[PDB]
Amino acid sequence: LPKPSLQALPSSLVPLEKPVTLRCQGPPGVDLYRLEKLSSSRYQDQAVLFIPAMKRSLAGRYRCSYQNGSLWSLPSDQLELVATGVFAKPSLSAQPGSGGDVTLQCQTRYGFDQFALYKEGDPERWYRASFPIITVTAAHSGTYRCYSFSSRDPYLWSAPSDPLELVVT
């Protein structure tokens, strides 16, 4: 029985105290939906979870499936629900790197050992690193932002940096 989709709306990156809705969606008219959070082993017999205000304890991995007749579906793609604004924003700078590359430095006061950088748009481009140094091969002009976090709590992220407006030649 084919897998349903699991979406977080408006985003799976959710600032603390801001809203998010998790929606499980399979074929229409099925008997029952099951939505679960993996770390806590707490789940519901409903397709939709509205989170009115995001908390650190709600961040983590979610999945869902549906039941029709007695049979269960394959589970959804894991939904990575991240709480942002848990820490002070980092500050983002950019320099030329090796060859046709741009090196973005995601600066942070704390000892963080994970960094995620993105360019606004459709589609978004994402880049990950453990060093606060993210090289980007053939980068595009755009509005870049970085998030810093710890690998011991990988779903609690900082506030996003201020945007860096990059132009590349």
Binding site: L32, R34, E36, L38, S41, Y43, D45, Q67
Partner: peptide, 21 residues
């Protein structure tokens, strides 16, 4: 009159535990 029929089934059980490594 006679006693009623059985009620509806209970809700589905908890998810299965995580698999081995």
């Amino acid at each position: 009159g006679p006693p009623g029929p059985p009620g509806p089934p209970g809700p589905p059980g908890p998810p299965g535990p995580p698999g081995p490594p």
